[PDB]
């Protein structure tokens, strides 16, 4: 009955939601140990053994499944009113994810697609602090790739690199050079 | 009249061509040179400077308008035909600008617009060795972050430096979370 439900509940989620529910449940899961998990079941009997899901303790459960905005299973399989829920979460202390782990959640969700392509770019660009803005053209690539001393003409390894994955016209001018300096 | 010819010229050369024209003189004129260089007419007298303009010397500059592929210029203004060129710079020896700009610049010829996107991408994946794609979602580079330590419950800057330049809501959010942690 409690552990077929749990499948009940498994069978309604899809990728994404598992994708959500492993990582709010980061705080007791390591992220290493979640690669094995490829459904939301195993994810469930994963928190069954850590004492965190059973016939007595469905508080978890009953957070997780609110906190990706999953009510219709909350209702239909928990009996469990959003009300009830946000009249829980408010009380300090009932909280059982870390606030962390809840604002990079909120984070992803009010996130768009353009928003999220903008923030990968913007990442990388911060990551590599080689802001590349649709101002500058191939050429001040090239310089700034001769000031990052990364192509020269003795160093064409990053440069066919990434010829290579855009256009093999490219790669066979690289080529056809590299071969007269004979 | 020679001057008067080369300013001319350089008056029907616009952006794009000063700075090709530029990028194929960095084999005599340094890059932190050019900067001073607003026009076409700059260039060229910079280049008499170096003596590798005059009256008596044409040689470099037909060689740089037909690199840039200004024949018309070359018709009007110096009495050049492309048949003319091709063969002159076939022999060897007779060619003044190094074969990786060349390279570099035909490089820049053969690449288009979203060539050109995705070179900046790629680039950027290979300098930061972060390769993300649109296939994993903001959560999984969340989790990229805490593997390069540069994500966590005490490492905010980077995380608000993206999204202070996406959407002051997300920022609101991480500012929510980072003041209830009094």
Redesign the interface.
């Given at each position: 009955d409690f552990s077929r439900n749990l499948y009940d509940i498994g069978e309604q989620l899809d990728s994404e939601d598992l994708?959500?529910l492993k990582?709010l449940s980061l705080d007791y899961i390591p992220?290493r140990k979640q690669e094995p998990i490829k459904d939301a079941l195993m994810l469930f009997q994963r928190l069954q053994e850590k004492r965190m899901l059973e016939e007595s303790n469905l508080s978890f459960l009953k957070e997780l499944l609110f906190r990706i905005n999953r009510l219709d299973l909350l209702i239909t399989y928990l009996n469990t009113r959003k009300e009830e829920m946000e009249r829980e979460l408010q009380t300090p202390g009932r909280a059982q994810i870390?606030?962390?782990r809840?604002?990079?959640?909120?984070?992803?969700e009010?996130?768009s697609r353009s928003?999220?392509?903008?923030?990968?770019?913007?990442?990388?660009?911060?990551?590599?602090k080689?802001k590349?803005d649709?101002d500058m053209?191939?050429?001040?690539?090239?310089?700034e790739?001769?000031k990052?001393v990364?192509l020269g003409?003795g160093k064409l390894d990053?440069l066919k690199?990434?010829?290579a994955?855009?256009?093999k016209?490219?790669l066979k001018?690289?080529n056809?050079?590299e071969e007269?300096?004979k």
């Open positions: 994708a959500s990582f992220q870390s606030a962390y809840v604002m990079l959640y909120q984070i992803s009010e996130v928003e999220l392509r903008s923030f990968k770019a913007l990442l990388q660009e911060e990551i590599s080689c590349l649709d053209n191939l050429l001040d690539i090239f310089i790739m001769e990052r990364i003409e990053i690199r990434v010829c994955q855009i256009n016209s490219l001018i690289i056809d050079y007269f300096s």
